[PDB]
Design an enzyme around this catalytic site. Sequence first.
Site, PDB file in Angstrom:
ATOM      1  N   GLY A  15       0.777  -1.175   0.113  1.00  0.00           N
ATOM      2  CA  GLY A  15       0.160  -0.160   0.043  1.00  0.00           C
ATOM      3  C   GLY A  15       0.859   1.051   0.074  1.00  0.00           C
ATOM      4  N   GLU A  16       0.232   2.276   0.072  1.00  0.00           N
ATOM      5  CA  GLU A  16       0.859   3.765   0.093  1.00  0.00           C
ATOM      6  C   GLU A  16      -0.215   4.641   0.803  1.00  0.00           C
ATOM      7  OE1 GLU A  16       0.987   5.606  -4.100  1.00  0.00           O
ATOM      8  OE2 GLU A  16       2.843   6.534  -3.188  1.00  0.00           O
ATOM      9  N   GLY A  17       0.539   5.774   1.423  1.00  0.00           N
ATOM     10  CA  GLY A  17      -0.296   6.729   2.289  1.00  0.00           C
ATOM     11  C   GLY A  17       0.658   8.192   2.296  1.00  0.00           C
ATOM     12  N   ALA A  18       0.367   8.950   2.889  1.00  0.00           N
ATOM     13  CA  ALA A  18       0.806  10.220   2.976  1.00  0.00           C
ATOM     14  C   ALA A  18       2.579   9.928   3.880  1.00  0.00           C
ATOM     15  CB  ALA A  18       0.032  11.193   4.168  1.00  0.00           C
ATOM     16  N   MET A  21       5.688   4.797   1.508  1.00  0.00           N
ATOM     17  CA  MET A  21       4.942   3.345   0.760  1.00  0.00           C
ATOM     18  C   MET A  21       5.487   2.194   1.654  1.00  0.00           C
ATOM     19  SD  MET A  21       5.919   2.340  -3.258  1.00  0.00           S
ATOM     20  CE  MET A  21       7.557   1.285  -2.970  1.00  0.00           C
ATOM     21  N   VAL A  22       4.697   1.015   1.552  1.00  0.00           N
ATOM     22  CA  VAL A  22       4.965  -0.114   2.366  1.00  0.00           C
ATOM     23  C   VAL A  22       5.082  -1.209   1.393  1.00  0.00           C
ATOM     24  CG1 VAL A  22       2.641  -0.560   3.241  1.00  0.00           C
ATOM     25  CG2 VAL A  22       4.655  -1.410   4.593  1.00  0.00           C
ATOM     26  N   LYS A  32       8.663  -0.248   5.120  1.00  0.00           N
ATOM     27  CA  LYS A  32       7.914   0.986   4.708  1.00  0.00           C
ATOM     28  C   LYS A  32       9.057   2.210   4.555  1.00  0.00           C
ATOM     29  CE  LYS A  32       6.720   2.044   9.677  1.00  0.00           C
ATOM     30  NZ  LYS A  32       5.527   2.111  10.491  1.00  0.00           N
ATOM     31  N   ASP A 127      -4.647   7.916  17.450  1.00  0.00           N
ATOM     32  CA  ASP A 127      -5.329   7.618  16.169  1.00  0.00           C
ATOM     33  C   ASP A 127      -5.708   6.361  15.808  1.00  0.00           C
ATOM     34  OD1 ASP A 127      -6.348   8.563  13.681  1.00  0.00           O
ATOM     35  OD2 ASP A 127      -4.178   8.818  12.481  1.00  0.00           O
TER      36      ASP A 127
HETATM   37  C1  LIG Z   1      -1.145   1.454   9.510  1.00  0.00           C
HETATM   38  S1  LIG Z   1       0.082   2.172   8.155  1.00  0.00           S
HETATM   39  C2  LIG Z   1       1.537   2.217   8.784  1.00  0.00           C
HETATM   40  C3  LIG Z   1       2.173   0.777   9.019  1.00  0.00           C
HETATM   41  O1  LIG Z   1       2.627   0.820  10.168  1.00  0.00           O
HETATM   42  N1  LIG Z   1       1.657  -0.209   8.317  1.00  0.00           N
HETATM   43  C4  LIG Z   1       2.086  -1.379   8.219  1.00  0.00           C
HETATM   44  C5  LIG Z   1       3.057  -2.133   9.392  1.00  0.00           C
HETATM   45  C6  LIG Z   1       3.425  -3.401   9.327  1.00  0.00           C
HETATM   46  C7  LIG Z   1       2.763  -4.178   8.759  1.00  0.00           C
HETATM   47  N2  LIG Z   1       2.793  -5.590   8.333  1.00  0.00           N
HETATM   48  N3  LIG Z   1       1.854  -6.023   7.440  1.00  0.00           N
HETATM   49  C8  LIG Z   1       1.370  -5.142   7.018  1.00  0.00           C
HETATM   50  C9  LIG Z   1       0.060  -5.178   6.108  1.00  0.00           C
HETATM   51  C10 LIG Z   1       0.250  -6.164   5.012  1.00  0.00           C
HETATM   52  C11 LIG Z   1      -0.990  -6.574   4.183  1.00  0.00           C
HETATM   53  C12 LIG Z   1      -1.870  -5.541   4.146  1.00  0.00           C
HETATM   54  O2  LIG Z   1      -2.895  -5.789   3.306  1.00  0.00           O
HETATM   55  C13 LIG Z   1      -2.626  -6.470   2.151  1.00  0.00           C
HETATM   56  C14 LIG Z   1      -4.071  -6.949   1.893  1.00  0.00           C
HETATM   57  C15 LIG Z   1      -2.042  -5.882   0.975  1.00  0.00           C
HETATM   58  N4  LIG Z   1      -1.865  -4.525   5.019  1.00  0.00           N
HETATM   59  C16 LIG Z   1      -0.867  -4.484   5.863  1.00  0.00           C
HETATM   60  C17 LIG Z   1       1.855  -3.940   7.721  1.00  0.00           C
HETATM   61  C18 LIG Z   1       1.504  -2.366   7.432  1.00  0.00           C
HETATM   62  C19 LIG Z   1       2.474   2.851   7.420  1.00  0.00           C
HETATM   63  C20 LIG Z   1       3.111   3.798   8.064  1.00  0.00           C
HETATM   64  N5  LIG Z   1       3.125   3.903   9.597  1.00  0.00           N
HETATM   65  C21 LIG Z   1       3.349   5.159  10.271  1.00  0.00           C
HETATM   66  C22 LIG Z   1       4.731   5.624  10.435  1.00  0.00           C
HETATM   67  O3  LIG Z   1       5.679   4.669   9.753  1.00  0.00           O
HETATM   68  N6  LIG Z   1       5.107   6.583  10.853  1.00  0.00           N
HETATM   69  C23 LIG Z   1       6.275   7.327  10.554  1.00  0.00           C
HETATM   70  C24 LIG Z   1       6.050   8.367   9.802  1.00  0.00           C
HETATM   71  C25 LIG Z   1       5.016   9.125   9.543  1.00  0.00           C
HETATM   72  C26 LIG Z   1       4.557  10.418   8.510  1.00  0.00           C
HETATM   73  C27 LIG Z   1       3.184  10.650   8.318  1.00  0.00           C
HETATM   74  C28 LIG Z   1       2.941  11.415   7.417  1.00  0.00           C
HETATM   75  C29 LIG Z   1       3.981  12.172   6.469  1.00  0.00           C
HETATM   76  C30 LIG Z   1       3.623  12.991   5.353  1.00  0.00           C
HETATM   77  N7  LIG Z   1       4.525  13.306   4.577  1.00  0.00           N
HETATM   78  C31 LIG Z   1       3.898  14.040   3.674  1.00  0.00           C
HETATM   79  N8  LIG Z   1       2.532  14.084   4.131  1.00  0.00           N
HETATM   80  C32 LIG Z   1       1.557  14.805   3.500  1.00  0.00           C
HETATM   81  N9  LIG Z   1       2.421  13.660   5.048  1.00  0.00           N
HETATM   82  C33 LIG Z   1       5.218  11.676   6.984  1.00  0.00           C
HETATM   83  C34 LIG Z   1       5.516  10.864   7.860  1.00  0.00           C
HETATM   84  C35 LIG Z   1       3.648   8.547  10.314  1.00  0.00           C
HETATM   85  C36 LIG Z   1       4.279   7.500  11.534  1.00  0.00           C
HETATM   86  C37 LIG Z   1       1.698   3.398   9.754  1.00  0.00           C
END
Ligand SMILES: CS[C@@]1(C(=O)Nc2ccc3[nH]nc(-c4ccc(OC(C)C)nc4)c3c2)CCN(CC(=O)N2CC=C(c3ccc(-c4ncn(C)n4)cc3)CC2)C1
Length: 326
Positions: A15-18, A21-22, A32, A127
């Site tokens: 996935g991807e977000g603000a 990318m992960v 990520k 959050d």
């Molecule tokens: C819940 S999403 C997250 C995360 O931890 N994800 C994650 C972690 C471990 C995981 N293990 N497995 C998964 C996973 C696997 C499969 C899956 O679904 C499948 C169906 C594809 N979903 C999730 C997974 C996903 C990814 C990011 N994580 C937070 C995180 O890493 N943080 C550090 C930096 C942050 C941040 C926020 C915003 C910005 C920015 N820059 C510009 N803008 C406008 N905004 C900059 C920095 C916030 C805090 C949270």
Amino acid sequence: VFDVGPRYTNLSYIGEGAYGMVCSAYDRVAIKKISPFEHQTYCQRTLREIKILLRFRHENIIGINDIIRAPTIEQMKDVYIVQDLMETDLYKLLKTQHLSNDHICYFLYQILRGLKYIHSANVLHRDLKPSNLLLNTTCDLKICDFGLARVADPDHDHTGFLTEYVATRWYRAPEIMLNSKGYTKSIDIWSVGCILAEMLSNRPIFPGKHYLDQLNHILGILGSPSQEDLNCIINLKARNYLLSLPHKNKVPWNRLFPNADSKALDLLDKMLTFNPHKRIEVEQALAHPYLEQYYDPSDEPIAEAPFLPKEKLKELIFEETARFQP
Ligand SMILES: CS[C@@]1(C(=O)Nc2ccc3[nH]nc(-c4ccc(OC(C)C)nc4)c3c2)CCN(CC(=O)N2CC=C(c3ccc(-c4ncn(C)n4)cc3)CC2)C1
């Protein structure tokens, strides 16, 4: 660009977000990529995510397994955070599946078990929402995303009426819009109550379309606050606003959730209490009859002890990630 070798290979987009990318990668793990150093706010969220997650160790909290970054502060532009790979999140699961009560019960138990540990460290997540709850096929649940986390500070929770807030709208407690900065543990309990309601119907309970609309949705179901709750509201402008509203009666939980377990709705009522001082706390929630089959304080651990310009924050992130360098 995803530069994580020699240890991690065979990348695939998740996935991807603000935040960035992960992906998934073979050590399989989740990785990520964060590129926050141009802005003070992004550095603050990155340092919070890292400092807190490195200091926590709990089954229902995502860990940080490794952190990749350049060997010098000058060369450091990105940071890769390696975490346990999960299969999905509660947001995605709720788009495709109606959950049985016994899955809701077990997921709620895990959310509250992890939250007990977070709150015992004097930390607030701030959050909580379905997309920050990772799941696997064995139904293990892990809380993720501590970018908006804070150390609790109840003595400095006060703010004015209609003060801007960053955390996800639909999961904001009513007091955020009335008198609170979200520096007390009760803010997280409200969010958990919202998640429970969402698991019971597969729809957000208070989908405000904008800032004040969020309070409209809350008061539309809870009804008008009591005189005693208005006496606790602090702000002149919040009191005047609530007093100006027509009287609204409480919508019964059993009309909103006609097929839900009565004990689940009793706990929901206590988490979705208007007055944060009367709202159930995490240990009480764990002890509620709905969760009686899982409740075991001896198996609900607590933390061993409680818990700037962008250039200074970069130095702190550099120091905090130093333990992962060879
Ligand atoms: C819940 S999403 C997250 C995360 O931890 N994800 C994650 C972690 C471990 C995981 N293990 N497995 C998964 C996973 C696997 C499969 C899956 O679904 C499948 C169906 C594809 N979903 C999730 C997974 C996903 C990814 C990011 N994580 C937070 C995180 O890493 N943080 C550090 C930096 C942050 C941040 C926020 C915003 C910005 C920015 N820059 C510009 N803008 C406008 N905004 C900059 C920095 C916030 C805090 C949270």
